[PDB]
């Protein structure tokens, strides 16, 4: 798929990701969710290949929840994301590659920090405090180097991530039929309905 | 397509098959492969079609003028030069694979003309995606000091082994007869051995059968006077 | 390089009556210009009142027939010998056909016989396996020159009543064995004429309750 | 070919059409592209004829063997996904299939989208195949979910008449289908040849047709 | 093709195979290889026919207008022309050509002109897919100042073995023999040649 | 997949009233060059069956071990082997047919063109080809290679259809073979004058002719071709 | 890619008793994409008819080209052309571009008005005459009108009988055929009267 | 460009080409007009490669104007179609072909009439009474072909042109940043500045 | 390369040059093609060094195995198992290997085992890319049951011009003469052959 935002505030991780799923010529839906929830406080937003990224998605879920029950314990965002970062690295070298990139936002109840990795296809991992795959780091990035500090709140990230979605719908060729926004916190994860 | 030469006593005789294709499909089921350059020198072609009729039109036209102008009947190796040169030049680019026959002052002539250029003399020559076929008959029962009825014999032979071996011709036999101090003689459908069966039903429609949504008049004749 | 595909031209055709039907197919064998055989059978009496022809790649087309042939047998030994439907045939080489869907049977395949209320049924297959039972199916290399015409002339496409003028169809009445013999012995002898692959011979087999018959007619040769 | 399917107040209407291509030549007038699963799901079909049949006689084998384990019904959710996985193990291996799950569970009626690649799509309204574009347009402009099931049907027999139209590897004849909780209903075989000049007349469209 | 041409005292000799191919069909058994650009100075062709049939019939018109206005040229002029030709036309032709003559000044002279366009005068030369069979065998029998019986029976041997090998190469052999008496014609056909 | 080496050029055969004729000429090429000069290329399976190669020689030498082992095989535990359980040709050529179809299904076929002819028990006339893409038919004639194009044109001119065949004799229809062979030493550049004749008749048995030569040969108009066109001397 | 079926369509004529038939589909496409349904590749130049099939832009140059042509010989011979110097005309204009060729594949059709002889011929691309008895086809469907033709047609047929048998060739062989249909047209030809029917057909 | 729509109704004939221009995964404007007047009653919009549809434009502009000065009369539709059509088939077999599809609307003066040709780069000419190059038709020529009638005021021209953009913006992968509107007349031509 | 095996009276003897190219440059100009896989059964290799080594190296292995269990192999028995590595994997190696041995029951044989892995036994073999220049000179100056000093002539002359024409031959002549009275090494040093 086409876009998948994220910015790591004070509180919070927030992702966006775009709603456009594309077969030819023609837009067959406008309103996909491009994400899983690995574990009540970790999310994943994916976009790549068609029918690679869901199937990864949901073979990590998989694996995360089979670990949760077993252990009676939900691991740290950090330990997802290397999880996550192997299965990349594994896949890589294989006879048929996924072709995946994600980003991962989590808010550790241990350290009470958010926390967003971004990892590509390759298994290159990276802890940010905001990122982007494909070509919407170019758009977005500069307004993110500017307006950008640690201790926004979670309106302020979401006003500024306003700001990028707009510069994305200006100047890129691609219409990817706006977003939708997850915000990850203490309390857990939520949709926000209205952006 | 299948040609043939062969060369006999007094003269010479060409054949030729008459089918036409489109890659397996049938364009004509009577074709004419027996051009004629001049009145007594007669040349039959094989592949690009067009090519085959272009160049020996052009060249025919050069000798006519040529024979006008040097007040001399035409001569062979006039036109297999003319041909050789001209096709030389495009370099294989105009796909003319010729057989040219014909008598004049000189005696009675026989060669063959490849695409590229080069030419061949001979005493029977085959042409064509039957070539093969109908060279076998030619190795088979040629000989020296044949008659005239002797080698139109083994030239229409020679094109039937192509007719019925080689997918590529077909239907029926032509031939061209040059014979020394001789009109040549252009036998068209000398063999008609490939004539259809009768069809098992007519498939005569009921007039009304078919649908229609408007008629008019058409006018093909010029403005009208008063 | 080597390639392990072929074409041996010939074309073929099924027709299904109301009580029988009929699977004719030239005796045409060809490579590129040359002609292997005059009379080499294509349409094949495969047991259970059930005919069979594979067009296109002979070799791959003789492996089907001998494959199914085999399928028949051990349809009988595993269920107490039963027959073979003709909708269950088509159903098994379907499974035949995409048993090598990443190295197909190069071949249109066409099947004739009766359905299991006596009315005539045909069945055609394209080399992966989709099938699809018909009432008419022309196949090979002159497929595209024979259908329009059995279009024409068996379901009366684009035939209408006179004095109507388009508003009333030409009703569909059914054909007896002797019209559909005439139609594919007239459709084989337009296809001769105007493809090189076709002719030499044509061999029909007719389909009824009484059994499977065979009627050979001579094609043009050149 | 162009298939449509969608969602409604009533359920939810399939159609599609009959052509089948082999390059330029229309090998086929009349073909099925759809698929009785069971009495409550049907299978849409666009792509390679061969994969399509294959894969949805398959996926019906599977379906049947849920209920047999179960003793109840296959959710369409759980219908489509099944079908979804047997293509990923054939990733890259040259398939060819797009195809919509129609069908009525305890959730109510569902439709899904599925292609050779693995995706896996749930909404209110599909339409796959060459002629999809010429099919959205009619539905987009006149589609609601307050719809009865006789403009139902119809808006779905008019949106492949559309396509049929235009679109040169897309007609023959249109198939149409109801799903109900009572389980589908089959809503006939439509020549497009006699529907286009009907639909012309008594709908006054296509006026830059002469008949 | 197998074509070849060799000196002897009273001056030299053209051979040649017969036969001319289309892949592995012989489109003629019969060729004649051997072919006259001036009264007595001939060449023998291999490569493409079409250019070599090309450029001979060119430089025919070369010496028959050379000799209206200059008189009877040398074998030397005569492969100057052929490589001039050869030599600015080389990447368009693929010709093989051997040049042969005899004056009664500079008597038998051979000349052998390869794909490149360069020339090499020679005793003997040897030309033709056919000629790679034959080098050991030539290089050994070969002799200079041989009398015309030995230099026949020198290149009817030498063809022989390659005709024997070469598929390419086949049907009659023709030789040509040029000397101060005239012009002679030879032909020799397989029952005589493939028992040697 | 690979490509032939050492090849063998055309085997022709043709039905005759009382049985069949099998021809091929003695040569292996190395592409252009006429490397060996005595390979045979008819190979016997007892006293009712020749197969005659051409292709690849090195899968010729290959399908001959496996004709020879066949034999051997057949004769295990089998009184009769001399008898009614002798091999026959239908059987020789289906076996044949089921290697060369199963070797192509594999992408590594032997390159070959097969000709299986024979006389079975009955006294029927077995003649049938086969091919490195496991392709099968039969005809009253058959060739490979060249003689498809040449001899095949020559021996329909003798039998153009099945009911020619009684009226065909033996006499007739090697005169037509050898006839054929010396039309493909004219026309194949890839052929030799020395070849290979067998004859099975369902009377007279196996009749098996090494070191043939075409002879009669025309060669003498030679002398009168002068030049390309235009040249006179 | 292919030129010659980018934009589809056929052509086909026919002889009859002392009349000729010439009929063509009317679509124009983009590949798949049907363009328009009034495309007519029939033309006509005083007595003698022209259609021409393949890519639709020769189509449309070369009508304004034989119209300029057909035009100065009528100047200075005073006199319409017949079809057989016409055919002889459209062969020696597509061949001085043998190398950059117009992608069309034409047909002639017209009974000569002095000898009163029907005439029908085609071409390939580059030229080449096809002078048939029986009946000329041209198009993206040509394999299935042979087979039409072949089967259907008789020898000296009267016009309104004619005129069925060349329709129904046509109208099977389109609907076999993608890139073929969307309307038909059929001419008519006698020695001093034309007549010019639309077919009712699917438009699908 | 990407997508230019035409409509003949009644009494005028409109046309509606995208704002949108892209170089590179940059959209550098979205205002431009894609149109060039070449009569007073004739308006050409154009499609294609980029620089070769400005520069054919204005090279056809300045033969149109020239033969009206020359003249002092304005050539019918029909003829500057024509005109087009011969310019693009003679480019087509040129060493270098200009890359550009056209749509021409004008009114007929002499028969009171609209008149909408479609000519593609190739120069195939078509009279049309609605029209699209590029993938424009797959979304739009459905609704047309349903909803068009020649009786059609100029009003409900636009609201026919409206609901097919909609769909183009629905159904379209790429944002082409809306359409300007043009409408030829009896009167002229005008621009419809708020659609 | 230029190599040869050739029978006579007495026996057998095998001959080669002693060039090795990488392309155009000489890596080794004394080299022994003539190698041993039994004590009077030896080969000649040509193509890819490296595959005719590890052939030759897997012949010698089954030769020694088959003598330990059945006693002396035949010549027959060597060609046969260098046939069964090159014929089952021709896909795989660019082998032409000349193999030749001595009985006292079948006295001196020739075995040629060129590219696709075919067998052919012979009176006298050549191969190697300098065997193409000689096949007419070996034709007609080989006879059967030579002499020992006759057959080391014919070697000697043959080799001489195959280096001679080509370079991808040279260096010196090396022989191996297989008889019943033993194995004799032979070596001739260009100074000898050049001159001849
Ligand atoms: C449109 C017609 C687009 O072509 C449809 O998608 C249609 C879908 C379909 C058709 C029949 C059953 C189920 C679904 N597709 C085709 O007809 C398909 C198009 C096609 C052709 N080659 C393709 C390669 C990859 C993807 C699509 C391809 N055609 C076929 O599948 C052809 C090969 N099959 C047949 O023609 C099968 N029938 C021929 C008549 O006899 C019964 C079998
Ligand atoms: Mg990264
Ligand atoms: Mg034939
Ligand atoms: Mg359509
Ligand atoms: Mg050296």
Redesign the pocket.
Known sequence: MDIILGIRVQDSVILASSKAVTRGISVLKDSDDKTRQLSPHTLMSFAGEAGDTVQFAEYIQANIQLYSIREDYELSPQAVSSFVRQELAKSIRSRRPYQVNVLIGGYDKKKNKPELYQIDYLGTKVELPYGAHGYSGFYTFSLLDHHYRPDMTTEEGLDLLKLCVQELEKRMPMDFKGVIVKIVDKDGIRQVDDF | TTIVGVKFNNGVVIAADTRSTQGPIVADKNCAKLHRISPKIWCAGAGTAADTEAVTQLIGSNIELHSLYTSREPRVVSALQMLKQHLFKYQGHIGAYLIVAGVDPTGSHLFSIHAHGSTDVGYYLSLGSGSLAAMAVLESHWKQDLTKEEAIKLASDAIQAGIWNDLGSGSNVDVCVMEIGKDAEYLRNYLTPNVREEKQKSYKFPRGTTAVLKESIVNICDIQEE | QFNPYGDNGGTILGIAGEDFAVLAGDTRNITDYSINSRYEPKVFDCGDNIVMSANGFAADGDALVKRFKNSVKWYHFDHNDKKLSINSAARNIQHLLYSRRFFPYYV?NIIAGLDEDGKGAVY?????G???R?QC?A?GAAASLIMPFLDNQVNFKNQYEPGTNGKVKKPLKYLSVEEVIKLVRDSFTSATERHIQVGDGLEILIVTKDGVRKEFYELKRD | ???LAFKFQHGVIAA????????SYI??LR???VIEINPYLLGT?????????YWERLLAKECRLYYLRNGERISVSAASKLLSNMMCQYRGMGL?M?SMICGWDKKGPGLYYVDEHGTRLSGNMFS????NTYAYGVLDSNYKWDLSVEDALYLGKRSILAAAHR?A??GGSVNLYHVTEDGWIYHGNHDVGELFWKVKEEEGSFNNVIG | TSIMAVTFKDGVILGADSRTTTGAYIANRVTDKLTRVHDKIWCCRSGSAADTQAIADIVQYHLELYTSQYGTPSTETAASVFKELCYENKDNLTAGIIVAGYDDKNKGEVYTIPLGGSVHKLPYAIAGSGSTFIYGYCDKNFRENMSKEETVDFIKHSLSQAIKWDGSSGGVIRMVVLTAAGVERLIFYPDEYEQL | TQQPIVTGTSVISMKYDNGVIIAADNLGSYGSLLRFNGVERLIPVGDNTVVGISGDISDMQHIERLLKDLVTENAYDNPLADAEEALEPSYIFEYLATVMYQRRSKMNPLWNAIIVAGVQSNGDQFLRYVNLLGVTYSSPTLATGFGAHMANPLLRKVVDRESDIPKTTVQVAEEAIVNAMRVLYYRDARSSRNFSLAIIDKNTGLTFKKNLQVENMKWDFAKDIKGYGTQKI | SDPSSINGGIVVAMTGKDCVAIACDLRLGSQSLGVSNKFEKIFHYGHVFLGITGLATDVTTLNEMFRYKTNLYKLKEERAIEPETFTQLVSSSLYERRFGPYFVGPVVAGINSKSGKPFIAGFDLIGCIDEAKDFIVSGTASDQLFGMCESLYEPNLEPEDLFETISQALLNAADRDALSGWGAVVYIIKKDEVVKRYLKMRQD
């Open positions: 249109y055609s297959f394209d080399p992966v989709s099938y699809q018909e199916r196949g | 070919t162009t298939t599609v059409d009959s052509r089948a291509s082999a390059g090998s086929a073909m099925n592209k079909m666009s792509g390679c004829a061969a994969d399509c049949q060819s797009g796959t195949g060459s002629g679109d590897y897309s």
